[PDB]
Design brief:
Layout: H1 14-19, H2 21-33, H3 38-53, H4 58-73, H5 85-96, H6 108-130, H7 140-145, H8 155-168, H9 180-210, H10 216-223, H11 226-240, H12 249-256, H13 264-267, H14 272-281, H15 295-308, H16 313-318, H17 323-337, H18 343-365, H19 368-380, H20 386-389, E1 399-412, E2 423-431, E3 434-438, E4 456-459, E5 465-469, E6 474-479, E7 484-490, H21 493-506
Antiparallel strand pairs: 1-2, 1-7, 2-3, 3-4, 5-6, 6-7
């Protein structure tokens, strides 16, 4: 009860805090700031005693018992747990009778008494502090951030990608800044759309269970805490659509968004998330039968989402990682149309700090560049079907180089020359996990399709070597498995060099 009751609805139980490394570190900063670590320290010692027990001799178990006693439970001890008389007397009486053969559960009674104190006197105040009106403006978040002390791509590719990003932002819900009322309407519609994405993932999770495609463990690795976040976002939406909520914007964002820290429970799985779903998609059907073949199940959902929400399933998995940016963009807009120097604008500045803080917390336990590179790779390859892209995202991935092609050919491996009249308008995309050629307009008009395949595709592991005829800006790769040399003729010297350097680093 002390470990499995949530004192705040939708917020983790003590056990759920203790079992996550990020959340436990926050609790520990909080406890350390108050200089009251004894309860947690006692619980970890007991935990360590129990996990060490089986492989130790009785002699060494007794040593460990006496040490733990001397630290936390003895009447003169330095880190004494604040046990009341009637509890302390029961515990020490029993301990004083264990002189001989220390059992594995000698600390059960004391453990239960200490969990009770941790839950009631400490964990309770910790969860309350994460929900205080003043969190994120020398609190537990900044104490935590004080324990921690650069472009996504090399120059030529960075320019190309940055160009495409200007177009990717022409979606979707424009923020209507006519008035504050109008801007809240925008945010409500945005949240509703976003919850629609989260709800679709939830339903996809349901589909995989009913089909027995995945067990409960793998589904946790994919969708952990997604239902809990949906609930908080729904509570936020209900708050925003309250009558004259346009009069209380600052307060609603502050209190409505404290739960953002809880994104940790989902985000700790990103981007392993994506890699796993790809692994699942790549299982040969012969190993599971036509019946439990996951691929057509993923494909049907992916196709469905791309037609409906213009997002693939892999994009939806990485999407929540960037949610805070949307809130920061809204807050900057609310501030701009709010009366200068007013109380209402000071409330919004507070929210501005909070959101910057949430983003910082996320950065301490994830690799932003790795995740952003994956996210960019998914937007660029949106026209391609899940089946076509999955080997590319089965591990860490990113775009390493892009060149539009003037010529292309496939000869036998080791052939010194390509054929004449091999002129084709194509695009070469070098990715970390593979080399792609496509006839699909993928950079700048761009395709409105969602079902495309790759004209040429080579897993990076299947490339023995590569060469270049620099004279004509030509790149070739030798691919033994299929006994082919594949030739890429580039239009830009610039993109040619970009692509050569890319292959040099990757291969």
């Amino acid at each position: 009860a002390a470990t499995e009751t949530a004192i705040l609805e939708g917020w983790p139980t003590l056990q759920e805090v203790l079992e996550d490394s990020f959340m436990k570190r926050l609790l520990r900063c909080y406890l350390s700031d108050e200089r009251s670590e004894e309860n947690l320290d006692f619980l970890e010692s007991v935990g360590l005693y129990e996990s060490q027990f089986d492989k130790l001799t009785p002699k060494v178990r007794l040593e460990a018992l006496n040490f733990i006693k001397d630290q936390f439970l003895d009447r003169n001890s330095e880190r004494q747990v604040n046990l009341s008389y009637q509890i302390q007397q029961s515990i020490l009486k029993k301990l004083s009778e264990v002189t001989s053969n220390a059992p594995k559960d000698v600390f059960n009674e004391a453990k239960k008494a200490t969990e009770y104190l941790l839950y009631t006197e400490q964990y309770t105040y910790f969860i309350n502090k994460l929900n205080a009106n003043t969190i994120g403006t020398k609190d537990v978040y900044s104490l935590y951030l004080n324990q921690f002390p650069q472009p996504l791509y090399k120059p030529t590719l960075n320019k190309i990608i940055e160009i495409e990003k200007k177009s990717w932002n022409e979606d979707e819900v424009k923020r209507n800044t006519e008035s504050i009322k109008s801007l809240v309407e925008s945010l409500i519609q945005d949240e509703c759309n976003y919850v629609g994405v989260l709800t679709s993932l939830s339903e996809f999770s349901e589909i995989m269970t009913k089909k027995q495609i995945l067990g409960p463990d793998v589904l946790k690795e994919l969708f952990d805490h997604i239902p809990v976040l949906i609930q908080h976002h729904q509570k936020f939406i209900s708050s925003l659509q309250e009558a004259k909520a346009d009069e209380k914007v600052g307060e609603k964002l502050n209190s409505g968004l404290h739960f953002l820290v809880l994104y940790r429970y989902y985000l700790r799985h990103v981007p392993k998330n994506i890699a796993k779903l790809c692994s699942i998609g790549m299982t040969d059907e012969i190993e599971v039968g036509r019946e439990l073949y996951p691929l057509p199940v993923i494909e049907e959902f992916d196709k469905q989402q791309k037609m409906t929400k213009k997002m693939s399933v892999l994009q939806m998995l990485v999407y929540p990682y960037f949610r805070v940016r949307t809130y920061q963009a809204y807050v900057d807009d609310f501030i701009k149309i709010t009366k200068k120097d007013s109380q209402e604008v000071k409330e919004l500045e507070v929210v501005h700090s909070q959101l910057a803080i949430f983003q910082e917390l996320i950065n301490t336990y994830s690799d932003i560049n790795k995740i952003e590179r994956i996210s960019d790779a998914l937007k660029l390859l949106f026209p391609f079907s899940f089946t076509s892209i999955m080997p590319l995202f089965e591990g860490k991935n990113g775009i390493c180089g892009i060149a539009s092609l003037d010529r292309f050919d496939k000869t036998d491996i080791n052939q010194l020359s390509m054929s004449l009249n091999s002129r084709k308008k194509l695009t070469l995309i070098i990715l970390y996990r593979g080399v792609v050629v496509t006839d699909v307009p993928v950079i700048r008009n761009v395709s409105n399709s969602i079902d495309k395949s790759f004209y040429s595709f080579t897993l990076i592991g299947d490339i023995r070597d590569f060469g270049t005829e620099d004279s004509t800006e030509t790149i070739y790769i030798d691919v033994p498995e299929i006994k082919k040399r594949i030739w890429f003729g580039c239009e830009s010297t610039e993109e040619f060099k970009s692509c050569v350097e890319a292959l040099r680093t990757i291969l």
